[PDB]
From Swiss-Prot:
Widely expressed. It comes from the Eukaryota. It catalyses: 13,14-dihydro-15-oxo-prostaglandin E2 + NAD(+) = 15-oxoprostaglandin E2 + NADH + H(+); 13,14-dihydro-15-oxo-prostaglandin E2 + NADP(+) = 15-oxoprostaglandin E2 + NADPH + H(+); 13,14-dihydro-15-oxo-PGF2alpha + NADP(+) = 15-oxoprostaglandin F2alpha + NADPH + H(+); 13,14-dihydro-15-oxo-prostaglandin E1 + NADP(+) = 15-oxoprostaglandin E1 + NADPH + H(+). This is Prostaglandin reductase 2. It comes from Homo sapiens. Functions as 15-oxo-prostaglandin 13-reductase and acts on 15-keto-PGE1, 15-keto-PGE2, 15-keto-PGE1-alpha and 15-keto-PGE2-alpha with highest activity towards 15-keto-PGE2. Overexpression represses transcriptional activity of PPARG and inhibits adipocyte differentiation. Substrate binds at residues 99-100, 288-290.
């Protein structure tokens, strides 16, 4: 009846950097009391995501995300299997997900807060529902469709920052699926650069820690940049914007280089860069995937189809054990992941 759970131990501060120690794992007893409409689930996988950085602050800065509470269990995207149900629409063995899954090994939840998933959409890789066939992938798809202005055969050049992460590795491929002739990725390591061009189909890759970014954009985007799928903001984006074309579009996915600072989101561009934006009529609007829930079902089917068609390559990085949730979040925030960071909590499904 003993389970492990992760609680928020301390807050780093809006200007601080997150560390594994901000999280603490403890044991609690799960009273075997399952009531009408509740189910008991065994957690299989949990996600860690950049937005969780905002939940670590007392104030998140937006109505759509609530702050985590000190000493209370943390929660986020999760996938699990139902071990017992007293909910009339859920059965033992069903696989389910929630965007508010407690970081705990076994949980008793209200069946109405869960969504039953279909394994065949992901060829049995349930963790994909937390990534490419889930919110990150929907964010890339919907962001490109809504903000990218790409048409088949316009021969536009797309640059993707955070290119080897969950949203960015998916965004680059979709840019090719939908019409961009050239897709260039910017990422933090040599190893990621290699994967971008050798496996994910990117035309070129730029390592921002070791290359002269401006020099490499000029060499790999000889015609300028028409669409920038921005995951990072900061200096990298100032550089990309510098080479963006008239009437180009920034899909403002996120600005992770700024998440450990108290600047409101999204940060403004500096005077000189905003001047370029205004002179060249570059569009930079906010994009929040939660504003498009009505596009979710068909987005998931589209992402699933591309995957089943052999076109979309889905990458993930796995860390094991609930005791490593904190380290996994810290690792993903600092570049340890290729693709979607996932934490495997259990494989027990019988
Ligand atoms: N608009 C929306 O609704 C949504 C937005 N997002 C946003 O998309 C972005 C990517 O999210 P996601 O794909 O889940 O996570 P990723 O898998 O991309 O993981 C984060 C990556 O960010 C990179 N990074 C971290 N710090 C910096 C830094 N200081 N400068 C440059 N790159 C950095 C790291 O890779 P590297 O080694 O290359 O530095 C790291 O692996 C985030 O900004 C997130 O907020 C996600 C979902 C929805
Ligand atoms: N900005 C983000 O990364 C984000 C992700 C999911 C929900 N809200 C915000």
């Amino acid at each position: 009846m003993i389970v492990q759970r992760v609680v928020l131990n301390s807050r780093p501060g809006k200007n601080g950097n997150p560390v594994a120690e901000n999280f603490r794992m403890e044991e609690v007893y799960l009273p075997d009391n399952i009531n009408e409409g509740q189910v008991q689930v065994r957690t299989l996988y949990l996600s860690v995501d950049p937005y969780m950085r905002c939940r670590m602050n007392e104030d998140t800065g937006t109505d759509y995300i609530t702050p985590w509470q000190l000493s209370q269990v943390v929660d986020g995207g999760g996938i699990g299997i139902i071990e017992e149900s007293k909910h009339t629409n859920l059965t033992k063995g069903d696989f389910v997900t929630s965007f508010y899954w407690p970081w705990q090994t076994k949980v008793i939840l209200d069946g109405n807060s869960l969504e039953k998933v279909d394994p065949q959409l992901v060829d049995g890789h349930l963790s994909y529902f937390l990534g490419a066939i889930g919110m990150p992938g929907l964010t890339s798809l919907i962001g490109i469709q809504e903000k990218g202005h790409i048409t088949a055969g316009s021969n536009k050049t797309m640059v993707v920052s955070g290119a080897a992460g969950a949203c960015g590795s998916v965004a680059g491929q979709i840019g090719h699926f939908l019409g961009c002739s050239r897709v260039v990725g910017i990422c933090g390591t040599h190893e990621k650069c290699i994967l971008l061009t050798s496996e994910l189909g990117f035309d070129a890759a730029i390592n921002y820690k070791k290359d002269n970014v401006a020099e490499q954009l000029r060499e790999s985007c000889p015609a300028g940049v028409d669409v920038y799928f921005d995951n990072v903001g900061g200096n990298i984006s100032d550089t990309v914007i510098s080479q963006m074309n008239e009437n180009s579009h920034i899909i403002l996915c996120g600005q992770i280089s700024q998440y450990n600072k108290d600047v409101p989101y999204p940060p403004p561009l500096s005077p000189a860069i905003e001047a370029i934006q205004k002179e060249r009529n570059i569009t930079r609007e906010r994009f929040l995937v939660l504003n498009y829930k009505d596009k979710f079902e068909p987005g998931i089917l589209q992402l699933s189809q591309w995957f089943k068609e052999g076109k979309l390559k889905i990458k993930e990085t796995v860390i094991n054990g609930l005791e490593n949730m904190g380290a996994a979040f810290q690792s993903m925030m600092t570049g340890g992941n290729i693709g979607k960071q996932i934490v495997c909590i259990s494989e027990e499904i019988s």
